[PDB]
Design a protein around this nucleic acid. Structure first.
Ligand SMILES: [Mg+2]
Ligand SMILES: [Mg+2]
Ligand SMILES: [Mg+2]
Ligand SMILES: [Mg+2]
Ligand SMILES: [Mg+2]
Ligand SMILES: [Mg+2]
Ligand SMILES: [Mg+2]
Ligand SMILES: [Mg+2]
Ligand SMILES: [Mg+2]
Ligand SMILES: [Mg+2]
Ligand SMILES: [Mg+2]
Ligand SMILES: [Mg+2]
Ligand SMILES: [Mg+2]
Ligand SMILES: [Mg+2]
Ligand SMILES: [Mg+2]
Ligand SMILES: [Mg+2]
Ligand SMILES: [Mg+2]
Ligand SMILES: [Mg+2]
Ligand SMILES: [Mg+2]
Ligand SMILES: [Mg+2]
Ligand SMILES: [Mg+2]
Ligand SMILES: [Mg+2]
Ligand SMILES: [Mg+2]
Ligand SMILES: [Mg+2]
Ligand SMILES: [Mg+2]
Ligand SMILES: [Mg+2]
Ligand SMILES: [Mg+2]
Ligand SMILES: [Mg+2]
Ligand SMILES: [Mg+2]
Ligand SMILES: [Mg+2]
Ligand SMILES: [Mg+2]
Ligand SMILES: [Mg+2]
Ligand SMILES: [Mg+2]
Ligand SMILES: [Mg+2]
Ligand SMILES: [Mg+2]
Ligand SMILES: [Mg+2]
Ligand SMILES: [Mg+2]
Ligand SMILES: [Mg+2]
Ligand SMILES: [Mg+2]
Ligand SMILES: [Mg+2]
Ligand SMILES: [Mg+2]
Ligand SMILES: [Mg+2]
Ligand SMILES: [Mg+2]
Ligand SMILES: [Mg+2]
Ligand SMILES: [Mg+2]
Ligand SMILES: [Mg+2]
Ligand SMILES: [Mg+2]
Ligand SMILES: [Mg+2]
Ligand SMILES: [Mg+2]
Ligand SMILES: [Mg+2]
Ligand SMILES: [Mg+2]
Ligand SMILES: [Mg+2]
Ligand SMILES: [Mg+2]
Lengths: 136, 55, 74, 175, 104
RNA sequence: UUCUCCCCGAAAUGUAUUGAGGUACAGCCUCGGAUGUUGACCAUGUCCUGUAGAGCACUCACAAGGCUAAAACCUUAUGAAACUCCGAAGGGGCACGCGUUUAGUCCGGGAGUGAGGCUGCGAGAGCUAACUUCCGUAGCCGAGAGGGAAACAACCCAGACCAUCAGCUAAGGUCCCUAAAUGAUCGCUCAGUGGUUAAGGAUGUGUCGUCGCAUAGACAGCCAGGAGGUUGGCUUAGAAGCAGCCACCCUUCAAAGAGUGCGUAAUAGCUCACUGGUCGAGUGACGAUGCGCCGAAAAUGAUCGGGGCU
RNA sequence: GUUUGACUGGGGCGGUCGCCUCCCAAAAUGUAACGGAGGCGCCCAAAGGUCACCUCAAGACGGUUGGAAAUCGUCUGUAGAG
RNA sequence: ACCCCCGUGCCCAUAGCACUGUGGAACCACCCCACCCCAUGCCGAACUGGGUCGUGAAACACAGCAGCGCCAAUGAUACUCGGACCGCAGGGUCCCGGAAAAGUCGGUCAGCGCGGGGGU
C-alpha cells in the first residue's frame, strides 16, 4: 500500500516491463498481460482473497508495489491552480511482469486462488508454473 | 542507374523535397541517368520510395 | 510554487577540427567538464578560449579529465 | 540433437519457430540455429546440469551443456539459447536444483518447508558426472530450523561455490 | 609524504613553456640533479654526485650545482625550471641553486 | 473602400510594452543594385550530447529470507521527471566535394503579419475525457481547385498557363444506382458477422501442439457390488463421509476411499470413486491461434449511401 | 479636473509580476502552462593578492570526565566530506 | 652488449589491491645525533641540519599468483532514422538500415622513452 517516502506527484507513459519476468520465489505465479496501473487496493484485494483461500497455510509474495502517486483535481473546478495533492498510489504493470506467486499449495488450489484474485484486476492475466530458470 | 519520379513531393518532409530537387526531378514521370558515386547513391537512397530505381 | 525558472545558454562553442582565431571562446561550462589544454586559457567562469590561432582539437580520457587544445597552423 | 544454419540474417529463423543458438569455448564461438520443439523436449529432460550432443549438418558431433536461454517476456516461448562446449575437466560453477526428501516432522505440526534457494551453484562438478539433482533430507528439521550449505552433502570432486553459512531450505511456521 | 611532489610538478610543468626542467633529487646523500626537456621524453645534462665528496651535505651539494652549471653551459642552456622535489628550498638545495646559476 | 491582365508571395513566431483584438525591433514577402557560387541536398572525416533503452555503482523508494542489542552487512528481488557504473538510433558545429543540383549574402525603397486550425509522433496540465489546453516536431487548411474518403478545411492521391467528343496512370475501385473482372486459385464465417464496446461466459466452427487411458479389450450405456474398525478424535444441546476443527491408519478383496453430490436439527435413504459380465471402437483433460456466439437498453421513421449480397 | 495597472481556461476574490538552480525540454542551443520543487534583493578587511604547509565523512577495536555521537590512539577509507 | 639500481617522463586500473618470495653494504630505505641554520597551532614524528655502524625488520624495488577489483567479446534482444500499418484507447505490428545496457566466452596483475650509478 502507500509508501512512507518522497516527492508527491509524477507523470505517465509506457513500455514493456523488464524488472521481474521470472518467478524467483515460490512455486507458481500469476502474471500480467496488459499495461495498466494496478495501485493499492486492487492489489490488497488480491492479497485478502488469496489469504482467505490459502491462509493457515501457504506463502504469499507480492512482487509488485504501489510506487507511483496519482492525482485527482477537486470536485468540479476549471483547469485551475496546480494538480491534486493525493488520491491513490499505483504500480505500473507491463506484460510478463509477475505480480503473484504462491508457495506450499497444490497445483489445483493455486489455480483456484489465482482465478479468484484475477477476477478483480483491471488486466486479464495468465498463470504459470516456473519453467527452467536462469538469472542468479 | 536510371531513375524516375513516381510519387509526388507534396505532403513529404523537407529533406525529401530538396533531395528530389537536387537529383534533377521536377515532375512525376521525369526520368534521369545518374552516376553511382557515394553521395548520389545516398541521395537516391534518401528518397527511394519516391523513385523507381531501374537497376 | 511553480512560476520560477531561468535561461543561461551554455556548452561547447568551438568543436574539434575547427579553425579558431586567437581569443575565440571554445567552451562555456559551469565547472571543469573540459580542462584547458595546451594553448588554451580559462576565465572566471571556466570558459576556455584560444590563446593563439590554430586548429581546435579534443583530448578525451575518462570524463574526469578531458582537455581542449590548439594546434597552430604553419 | 540437430541444427543447421547460422546466418547473420534471422528472417528464416522466426518462420519455422526454430530457436537461434550458439556454441563457444576458448577456441571457437560459432553461432548456429536448431529446431524448437525437440529442443524443448530436451531442455525438459535436462536443465542446466543436463547435456546433449549437437550434430551440425557438417558431420561432427559435439557435446554441449546448456548455459542460458533468453526468451520472450510477453509470449512465454523461449527465444534464444547458448550451449557451451565443455572439455572434460570439471565444468565451471554449474547450477544444481535443490530437492527435498522425506516428510519433515516440522510439516506435521503446522509448519511448512520452504526452499529458500531453488538452485545452488557448485563449482567443479566434474563433467559427465554432473549432479542432475541434489537431495536434502528435511525430516530432522523442526519449525524455524535452517539447513545451510554447510549441510548439503556432495558427490565426487565437488565443492560448494556459495558461502556455506547462507540459508538454503528452511521450515516456516503458520501464517 | 607525497602530495607536494606532484603539486610542484604540476605547477612546474604549467610554468614550463619554453624553459627546461631541473629536478633536484635530495632524499638520500645522492643529491642528483637533471635537466629535462619537457615534451621530448629526454634529459640532457645530469650532474649526480656519486663520485664527488666535499664534506657536509650542504657544501658537497654545492659543487654539484657547479658541476651541472658547466655541463648545461656546454649545451647552450638559456634558463630552466627548478622542479624542487618536496624539499623546502633549504640551504642544501638552495645552495645547489645558488651554485647552479651563480656559475651558469 | 469601385477598371483589367502579367510576376513574385507571406505572417499568425521571438523579446518588449498601464501591454495582451494595439504598437516598436527582429523574423518571414516583394522590388532595384552589388558579389557573384559562398546557398540546397547527400557522402566521408572529425568533434559535442545524456534522450530511448538498460542498470542499481550513488540519492530516495521498495519485496522474501540470513546474521544481529533492531543499523550496517550477505543471498534473492524491484521502481524512478527532478537517481545514473553505462548508453544508442538520431541531432548540432567544422572541413571537404571526392557530386548532384540552385540558390545564398550585402546594400537601399515598399509591405503585410504578430487571433491561427487539424492530424501523426514526443511530453506536461486533465480522468492516459474532450472538435480540451500549453510546448516540441512533420505535413495539410489558412491562401489549394482537381480525384478518393455517401455527404465532409484538415485524412488518402495530386499542386489547376489556355484549347481537344485523343492516350497513361495515383489514392481509390470493377453485381445495379455508377466508369471499370458476377475475374482466376487454396481456404474461412452461416453470424447479416460483414454493417455498433469490455470484464466475463460457451462442447459454434476450421489449424495446430501437450498430456493420460486403453482391444492382453478403455470412454458413455446396462445388470450385480459398494467394506468391518467407526456414531474416526475435538466439536457443540446434536453433528455419525457431508455445521466447523486434526488426520486420511489397519483387515478383505476382483473390492468398496475415515471417502463426491442430494437428504434430516442428527439418523437413515439415493448415488459417487474402484471391481465384475455383455458390448465393442476411440476416448478424456489442458494449451495458441483464424472467423464467428452471448454479454448488446433511449427518446419523430428506418437503413451498410441505397437496392440488395452467402 | 482627474486617478483608481496587467495576467487571468469569462470576470471578481485568491495568487503572480525582477533575478538564480533543477525537472519538464523529445542525448546540440532554444522552447509554454494559475506545470512539478527551491533560493536572492546578501555576505567577507579578510571568506580577497600571493607565498608556504596540512587532507576529509564514516565505521571497528582500546581507552579519564564520557557512557549512541564528546576528546585521544591504531586500522580501513576517490570522497561516502568540505 | 647483457643485469640491476636512482631519478624521471608518455600512458594514467588489461597497468590497482590482497596472499607470497627475494634484495643491502652498489643504489634507496629505515637508523644515530640535533644548541644552532630550519621547524612543529604540543611533539625533530613531518619539514630540517650533521653521519657511521646496525638492519632490510618496516618502506621501497623486483618476481610469483587470478581470491578481489578493472578490461571485456560472439549469438540475441531493447531501443531507433526511414518506409508502411492496427487498435475506440491505453498500447501493438511489418519491411529497411543503425545498435545498446547488462550478462556468458574470455583477458589482464602493463606497455613504451630519456638520463645518470654501479655490476659482468
Ligand atoms: Mg511501451
Ligand atoms: Mg515497442
Ligand atoms: Mg534484472
Ligand atoms: Mg504517409
Ligand atoms: Mg507561385
Ligand atoms: Mg527581458
Ligand atoms: Mg499582441
Ligand atoms: Mg517590421
Ligand atoms: Mg534581388
Ligand atoms: Mg554560405
Ligand atoms: Mg557548398
Ligand atoms: Mg527509462
Ligand atoms: Mg562493466
Ligand atoms: Mg560544385
Ligand atoms: Mg528595408
Ligand atoms: Mg509602393
Ligand atoms: Mg499570438
Ligand atoms: Mg501554436
Ligand atoms: Mg494528470
Ligand atoms: Mg483546439
Ligand atoms: Mg486569415
Ligand atoms: Mg482540395
Ligand atoms: Mg498550402
Ligand atoms: Mg475535394
Ligand atoms: Mg463526391
Ligand atoms: Mg465519413
Ligand atoms: Mg471537420
Ligand atoms: Mg475548400
Ligand atoms: Mg488503361
Ligand atoms: Mg491499385
Ligand atoms: Mg458499370
Ligand atoms: Mg466473384
Ligand atoms: Mg474475451
Ligand atoms: Mg458423457
Ligand atoms: Mg480633460
Ligand atoms: Mg484585465
Ligand atoms: Mg503563491
Ligand atoms: Mg537541450
Ligand atoms: Mg533536441
Ligand atoms: Mg512559445
Ligand atoms: Mg506537472
Ligand atoms: Mg623507480
Ligand atoms: Mg610484502
Ligand atoms: Mg654488495
Ligand atoms: Mg628517526
Ligand atoms: Mg622485507
Ligand atoms: Mg551481435
Ligand atoms: Mg533506412
Ligand atoms: Mg517509424
Ligand atoms: Mg531491425
Ligand atoms: Mg556488454
Ligand atoms: Mg606485481
Ligand atoms: Mg636505462
Amino acid at each position: 500500500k502507500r509508501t512512507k517516502f518522497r516527492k508527491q506527484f509524477r507523470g505517465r507513459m509506457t513500455g514493456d516491463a523488464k524488472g521481474g519476468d521470472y518467478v524467483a520465489f515460490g512455486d507458481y505465479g500469476l502474471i500480467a498481460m496488459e499495461p495498466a496501473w494496478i495501485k493499492s487496493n486492487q492489489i490488497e484485494a488480491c492479497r485478502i482473497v488469496m489469504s482467505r483461500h490459502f491462509r493457515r497455510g501457504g506463502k504469499i509474495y507480492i512482487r509488485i508495489f504501489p510506487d507511483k502517486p496519482v492525482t485527482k483535481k477537486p470536485a468540479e473546478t476549471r483547469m485551475g491552480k496546480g494538480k491534486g495533492a493525493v488520491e491513490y498510489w499505483v504500480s505500473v504493470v507491463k506484460p510478463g511482469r509477475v505480480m503473484f506467486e504462491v508457495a506450499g499449495v497444490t497445483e489445483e488450489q493455486a489455480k483456484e486462488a489465482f482465478r479468484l484474485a484475477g477476477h478483480k484486476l483491471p488486466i486479464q492475466t495468465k498463470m504459470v508454473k516456473r519453467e527452467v530458470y536462469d538469472e542468479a | 542507374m536510371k531513375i524516375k519520379l513516381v510519387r509526388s513531393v507534396i505532403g513529404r518532409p523537407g529533406n525529401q523535397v530538396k533531395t528530389v530537387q537536387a537529383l534533377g526531378l521536377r515532375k512525376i514521370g521525369d526520368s534521369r541517368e545518374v552516376s553511382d558515386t557515394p553521395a548520389v547513391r545516398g541521395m537516391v537512397k534518401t528518397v527511394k520510395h519516391l523513385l523507381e530505381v531501374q537497376e | 510554487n511553480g512560476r520560477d525558472s531561468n535561461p543561461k545558454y551554455l556548452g561547447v562553442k568551438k568543436f574539434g577540427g575547427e579553425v579558431v582565431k586567437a581569443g575565440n571562446i571554445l567552451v562555456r561550462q559551469r565547472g571543469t567538464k573540459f580542462k584547458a589544454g595546451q594553448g588554451v586559457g580559462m576565465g572566471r567562469d571556466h570558459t576556455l578560449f584560444a590563446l593563439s590561432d590554430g586548429k581546435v582539437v579534443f583530448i578525451n580520457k575518462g570524463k574526469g579529465a578531458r582537455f581542449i587544445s590548439i594546434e597552430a597552423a604553419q | 540433437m540437430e541444427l543447421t544454419a547460422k546466418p547473420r540474417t534471422p528472417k528464416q529463423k522466426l518462420d519455422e519457430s526454430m530457436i537461434a543458438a550458439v556454441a563457444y569455448n576458448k577456441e571457437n564461438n560459432v553461432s548456429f540455429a536448431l529446431d524448437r520443439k525437440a529442443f524443448d523436449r530436451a531442455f525438459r529432460q535436462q536443465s542446466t546440469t543436463g547435456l546433449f550432443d549437437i550434430t551440425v549438418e557438417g558431420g561432427e558431433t559435439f557435446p554441449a551443456l546448456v548455459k542460458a536461454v533468453q526468451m520472450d517476456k510477453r509470449k512465454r516461448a523461449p527465444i534464444h539459447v547458448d550451449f557451451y562446449m565443455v572439455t572434460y575437466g570439471e565444468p565451471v560453477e554449474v547450477s544444481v536444483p535443490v530437492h527435498t526428501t522425506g516428510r519433515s516432522q516440522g510439516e506435521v505440526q503446522g509448519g511448512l518447508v520452504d526452499i529458500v534457494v531453488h538452485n545452488l551453484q557448485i563449482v567443479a562438478p566434474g563433467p559427465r558426472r554432473i549432479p542432475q539433482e541434489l537431495v536434502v533430507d528435511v525430516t530432522k528439521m523442526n519449525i524455524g530450523d535452517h539447513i545451510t550449505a554447510g549441510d548439503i552433502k556432495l558427490p565426487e570432486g565437488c565443492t560448494l561455490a556459495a558461502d556455506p553459512e547462507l540459508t538454503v531450505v528452511s521450515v516456516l511456521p503458520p501464517r | 609524504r607525497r602530495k607536494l611532489r606532484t603539486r610542484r610538478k604540476v605547477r612546474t610543468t604549467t610554468a614550463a613553456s619554453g624553459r627546461l626542467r631541473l629536478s633536484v633529487y635530495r632524499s638520500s646523500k645522492h643529491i642528483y640533479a637533471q635537466i629535462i626537456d619537457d615534451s621530448r621524453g629526454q634529459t640532457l645534462a645530469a650532474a649526480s654526485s656519486a663520485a664527488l665528496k666535499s664534506g657536509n651535505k650542504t657544501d658537497t651539494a654545492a659543487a654539484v650545482g657547479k658541476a651541472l652549471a658547466a655541463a648545461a653551459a656546454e649545451k647552450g642552456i638559456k634558463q630552466v625550471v627548478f622542479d624542487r622535489g618536496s624539499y623546502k628550498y633549504h640551504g642544501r638545495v638552495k645552495a645547489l641553486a645558488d651554485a647552479a646559476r651563480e656559475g651558469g
